[PDB]
């Protein structure tokens, strides 16, 4: 399984916990998850949960863990200047 060597939340390296969701490459500082110790056993990272509701996410910010279910995707993501990678409202689409 491939994972990034930098935290998806803050962008820096260090002690990172890795997502167990199939094919998810995301890794995170515990601090950046608002956790004080690694989750025990199989763990799915915050990218798989909708920002707006309790449903699983299906549409993803490519620059941070924000993501959205089918009911919340419209208008929550826009194609960025970086190869059309989708970004949430927290990034300048011209320089994500």
């Amino acid at each position: 399984q491939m994972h990034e060597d930098y935290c998806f939340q803050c962008g820096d390296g260090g002690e990172l916990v890795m997502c167990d969701k199939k094919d998810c490459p995301k890794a995170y500082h515990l601090l950046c998850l608002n956790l004080t110790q690694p989750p025990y056993g199989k763990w799915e990272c915050p990218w798989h949960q909708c920002d707006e509701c309790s449903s699983a996410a299906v549409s993803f910010c490519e620059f941070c863990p924000h993501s959205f279910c089918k009911d919340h995707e419209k208008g929550a993501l826009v194609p960025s200047a970086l190869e059309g990678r989708l970004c949430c409202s927290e990034h300048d689409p011209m320089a994500p």
């Binding site: 060597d5 820096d12 390296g13 260090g14 002690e15 890795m18 997502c19 989750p39 056993g41």
Partner: peptide
């Protein structure tokens, strides 16, 4: 969950 230690920018 598994952890690793990488270089910190």
């Amino acid at each position: 969950a598994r952890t690793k230690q990488t270089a910190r920018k």
